[PDB]
């Protein structure tokens, strides 16, 4: 349950723990615009198996990743899954350098944020004439 209304705005800090929630809104919202009735509970548990967490990259940047196991069953399996990911934003233009597939898996916040921290990057600063 996420939140999202125009109230005051005052100076206030989000620690680590914090910003797991910011980043959680900001992606579903690109799930929900797109009809994705299940939400993001967990960030952490949210990017394991690289599933769900495709199905927002997909869609802020309008693209599809093939690389993109879908079926996730191994414990390596959905490595590539996350994997798959970092490499293509990669491509678009985003610092992925330091992170890793598999701290990811394990629900690794100092992790997980870390890529919610660049993703949300590419789209900032986008606008064409």
Known sequence: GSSGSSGKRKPVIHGLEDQKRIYTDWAN?????????????????????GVLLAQIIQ????????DINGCPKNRSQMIENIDACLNFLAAKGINIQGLSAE???????????????????????????
């Open 103 to 129: 701290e990811i898996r394990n629900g690794n916040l100092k992790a997980i944020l870390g890529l919610f921290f660049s993703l949300s990057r590419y789209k900032q600063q986008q606008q064409q004439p």
């Open 29 to 49: 919202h690109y799930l929900a615009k797109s009809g994705h009735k299940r939400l993001i509970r967990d960030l952490q548990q949210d990017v394991t198996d």
């Open 59 to 66: 869609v802020v940047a309008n693209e599809k990743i093939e």
